[PDB]
Design a protein around this ligand. Structure first.
Ligand code: CA
Ligand code: CA
Lengths: 238, 239
């Protein structure tokens, strides 16, 4: 039917606009933070082992304010030179086995992690990870934590004409932004079953009611943006 | 005339697109460069008179890659540490008399100078200036040179109908972008006389020929984007 295709078209417009909005907030913010993280890393490579220097650099106020927290974890122990005022590394914390560290050591390069559960804030964030070198010798890696607070802002600003909403997931189906924030950190299947994580239009039945779902991908992060509408309500509206 | 008014509407559309482009590409880039310059300054005031430290920092690859050049000028003896492989400051150079220095010194925070056109070429250059302090004492300032290469790309990528083009000036009317870069560094009145630097719409007759001009400002730089068309040719394309 034509009404049904119109709904699909409007969902598509809201989806494309959200894709573009993610790119223009998160990605440009990430691009800027990457150069800062890279330079900071090259500066610490002027005297890598010296914890007192790294500490002074990480507590310089512009840096301290551009990231949730920054830290350097050393190859030769589980100690972290950190700038996080509201956190300290508990008895067990081994930097060498956290994603930012492993990814950085693996790639020998600046990396960006998948969204992940932070030890400190317990919310989901992403990290820039950098290898810290000294004469070809790997001595540690750095994290530069980035809050995903803009995602929650994007998602809570759009209501698909009182029929539905948008949400965001990782490539593995983990929800990182949802109007109901209690859904974050859970697989999106928990609230939207029988939907494939793939781009293109799907119609599902859930408790005798019918929903239309569309996904678009944000390729540089490989996040998925989902748009879901209650088809009955939306049919009545349009 | 609904045709000419449609002309005006189409020129406005392009103008807005160009205002959006300058913010999205040049402002975004400067925002990120100011963050880098602010952090670099704070790091150097861990030990500012250590010229060996300063040099190591300014020569680190990302910093050296992200800017045309960076320099630290000292208040007490007017000496300079810089990373420009093609320039060495002699005693005929006093950084303390330079605009970025004075402005940084006076404002006591990061400043951005007016852009200029290097006379030995047509490169557009702007400088970020930062004050350097030690124990609450002003000990010098830094400059961070940014080349504005995006400007040429932006105006060279747009063609108004084929009836005209867009160009960019400073608040003082100096041309810093134009499809013919020969005009860069010159007052725009050189190729477009009897036009006011003012937001809005103007029509003038030059060489028995009629032109439509619209200007939008880019507020955080106070630059003006100009859009000019041969209005007869535009009239014919709409009709
Ligand atoms: Ca701490
Ligand atoms: Ca030099």
């Amino acid at each position: 039917g034509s009404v049904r295709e119109e709904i699909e078209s409007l969902v598509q417009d809201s989806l494309m606009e959200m894709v573009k909005g993610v790119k223009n907030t998160i990605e440009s913010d990430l691009a800027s933070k990457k150069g800062l993280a890279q330079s900071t890393t090259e500066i610490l490579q002027l005297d890598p082992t010296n914890k007192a220097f790294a500490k002074s650099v990480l507590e310089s106020p512009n840096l301290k304010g551009s990231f949730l927290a920054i830290g350097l974890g050393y190859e030769s122990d589980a100690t972290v030179v950190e700038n996080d005022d509201g956190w300290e590394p508990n008895a067990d914390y081994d930097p060498r086995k956290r994603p930012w560290y492993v990814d950085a050591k693996r790639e020998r390069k600046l990396v960006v992690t998948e969204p992940y559960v932070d030890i400190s804030t317990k919310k989901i964030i992403i990290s820039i990870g950098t290898p810290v070198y000294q004469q070809s010798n790997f001595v540690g890696a750095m994290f530069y934590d980035v809050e995903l607070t803009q995602l929650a802002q994007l998602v809570n600003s759009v209501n698909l004409f009182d029929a539905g909403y948008l949400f965001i997931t990782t490539k593995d189906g983990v929800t990182i932004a949802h109007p109901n924030a209690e859904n974050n950190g859970e697989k999106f299947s928990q609230f939207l079953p029988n939907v494939d994580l793939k781009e293109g239009t799907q119609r599902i039945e859930l408790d005798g009611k019918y929903y239309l779902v569309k996904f678009a991908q944000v390729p540089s992060e490989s996040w998925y943006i989902g748009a879901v509408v209650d088809e009955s309500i939306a049919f009545a509206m349009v």
